[PDB]
């Protein structure tokens, strides 16, 4: 196995395949075949594959080398470096200028494969749309819930919409985007690690994203990268059941103003429970906080509100999380009563909605 490639062609691919990819799981699989270098990393649950065209003379073969070391060596080389590589003995030799490195290898035959599977559902969409779907909901995923499926993200197709849903039982996020293709009705749960990877592979170019879903796997193609992940089994909660049936008390406020008011009040909230009280009245919101040390915060804001007066408690971090995710100009809070959840949305868009359950 021999290749010679410019540093600038290896770097992004090495970076993409290298996170996080027992010993052999810390190696990358390198394969030279049919004018292409393929680089593969896996953790057994998921897999990233990059392809690199070889325009310089090369020779076929495969090996496996430590991922961090190989990436750190390539990255440490100077701008415009050419990186010549050849297998030799039980070692892989890397040359550039008068820098020489000899890396240990494990057999390509030892490198694990994900089981083969069949695509059942397929669609294409813009990078920016997938970025939008994930960033809108990611923060509402559970971290280490005993209900494992809540630790991932639901991806749902309905009509011509792709939808993400994330929830931890206390708060929920849902975002739906049109993708201009007739889809089957279908839902899968992607583990949190897969969501992180799916997000990482979106470079922000004009390269579209091609998705393939099997019964137990999901695959995303963008540019010369193919990411595959196993799915999570379980009964993900239905966001339709969670959205308030009729939250006809409508409050609108400036997002930055509302956020910074909650942020200040939060300073004097209980350090563990983080409770704040909202008092809504005619075109006014009062936010209060206090803690066991009898310290007290009070914020008063002008808002648009015509409905009946009410009082309601929330974990302030949940509210702040929504506002930070929204990045809006104006926000609408849609209320029911003191003991029911609140729906929160950007006043200008209904593409995303957030539901937060109150505290007593």
């Amino acid at each position: 196995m021999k290749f010679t490639v410019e540093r600038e062609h290896l770097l992004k691919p090495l970076q993409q395949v290298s996170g996080p990819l027992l010993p052999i799981l810390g190696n990358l699989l390198l394969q030279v075949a049919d004018g292409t270098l393929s680089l593969t990393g896996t953790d057994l649950e998921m897999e990233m594959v990059a392809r690199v065209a070889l325009v310089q003379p090369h020779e076929p073969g495969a090996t496996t080398v430590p991922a961090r070391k190989f990436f750190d060596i390539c990255r440490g080389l100077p701008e415009g470096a050419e990186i010549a590589v050849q297998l030799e003995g039980e070692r892989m030799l890397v040359r550039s200028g008068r820098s020489r490195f000899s890396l240990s290898t494990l057999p390509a035959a030892d490198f694990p494969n994900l089981d083969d599977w069949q695509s059942e559902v397929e669609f294409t969409l813009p990078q920016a749309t997938m970025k939008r779907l994930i960033e809108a909901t990611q923060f509402s995923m559970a971290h280490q819930d005993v209900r494992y499926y809540l630790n991932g993200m639901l991806f749902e197709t309905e009509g011509e919409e792709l939808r993400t849903v994330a929830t931890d039982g206390h708060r929920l996020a849902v975002c739906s985007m049109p993708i201009g293709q007739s889809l089957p009705s279908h839902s899968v749960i992607v583990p949190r690690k897969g969501v992180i990877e799916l997000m990482r592979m979106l470079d922000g170019g004009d390269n579209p994203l091609r998705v393939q879903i099997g019964s137990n796997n999901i695959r995303a193609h963008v540019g010369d990268f193919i990411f595959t992940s196993k799915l999570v089994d379980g009964r993900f909660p239905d966001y339709r059941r969670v959205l308030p049936k009729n939250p006809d008390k409508h409050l609108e406020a400036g997002c930055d103003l509302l956020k910074q008011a909650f942020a200040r009040a939060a300073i004097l909230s209980n350090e563990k429970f983080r409770g704040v009280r909202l008092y809504v009245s005619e075109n006014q919101l009062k936010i209060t906080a206090n803690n066991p040390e009898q310290e007290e915060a009070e914020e008063i804001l002008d808002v648009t509100y015509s409905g009946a007066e009410m009082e309601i408690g929330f974990n302030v971090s949940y509210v702040l999380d929504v506002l930070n995710a929204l990045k809006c100009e104006n926000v609408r809070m849609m209320l029911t009563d003191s003991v029911s959840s609140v729906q929160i949305e950007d006043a200008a868009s209904q593409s995303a909605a957030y539901v937060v359950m109150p505290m007593r």
Partner: peptide, 5 residues
Amino acid sequence: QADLF
């Protein structure tokens, strides 16, 4: 804290 489901 109350729950959604």
